Amino acid sequence: VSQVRQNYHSDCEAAVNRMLNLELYASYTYSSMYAFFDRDDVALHNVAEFFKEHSHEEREHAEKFMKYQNKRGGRVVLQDIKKPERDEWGNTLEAMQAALQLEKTVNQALLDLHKLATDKVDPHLCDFLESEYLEEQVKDIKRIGDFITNLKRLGLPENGMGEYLFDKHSV
């Protein structure tokens, strides 16, 4: 047992490792979207940069879980980072729809971890999730939802002019 460990359940330690993996998975998915929008036959650089930034953000979320694990006396256990579900992302609307679903998946896992922390009576873990993860998640979900609404308004997927306009005025 780690000398620092106090009120940290084995189940929570394991769940933090799984959450770490999911953040890395989300980072990798966003990097794929960056790569797609940077293609010469897609060429929406502002959209590409949006996803690149989100990839970096998710990597930071992962690192924060690693630091958290060590602070509590848990042990970081890494697994493979699975490749993204798609190799190509269609267009801005398809990619944003995929990002929304990914963000909701990450949010559900955060909420599930919070429920586990509540069940195991771990207020430090609860506070960590609430203070560092849960609000940023709601904000990102709202931003992507707003984008989707605008892309539909702009006539995506069919309306190429609309897609250009979004890249030039929204991101």
Site residues (vs Cl ion, CB under 5 A): 4-8, 14, 17, 77, 79-80, 86-88, 111, 135-136, 138, 141
Question: Is 10 a residue that touches Mg ion (CB under 5 A)?
Answer: yes
| Cβ–Cβ < 8 Å for 109, 65 | no
Structure tokens at 78: 């890494």
Among 78, 66, 137, CA closest to 105: 137
In the complex with its own copies, the residue whose CB is nearer, 11 or 79, is 79
* Residue 61 assigned as binding residue: yes
Q: Rounded to an integer, what distance in angstroms lies between the CA atom of residue 148 and that of residue 150?
A: 5
Helix 160-169 × helix 135-153 angle, to 10°: 140
Binding to Mg ion in span 112-141, by CB under 5 A: 135
Binding to its own copies in span 69-128, by CB under 8 A: 69-73, 75-84, 87, 100, 104, 107-108, 111, 114-115, 118, 121, 123-124, 126-128
* Residue 69 assigned as binding residue: no
Question: Is 58 a residue that touches Fe ion (CB under 5 A)?
Answer: yes
| Cβ–Cβ < 8 Å for 64, 76 | no
| Residues forming the site for Fe ion (CB under 5 A) | 23, 54, 58, 61, 103, 136, 140
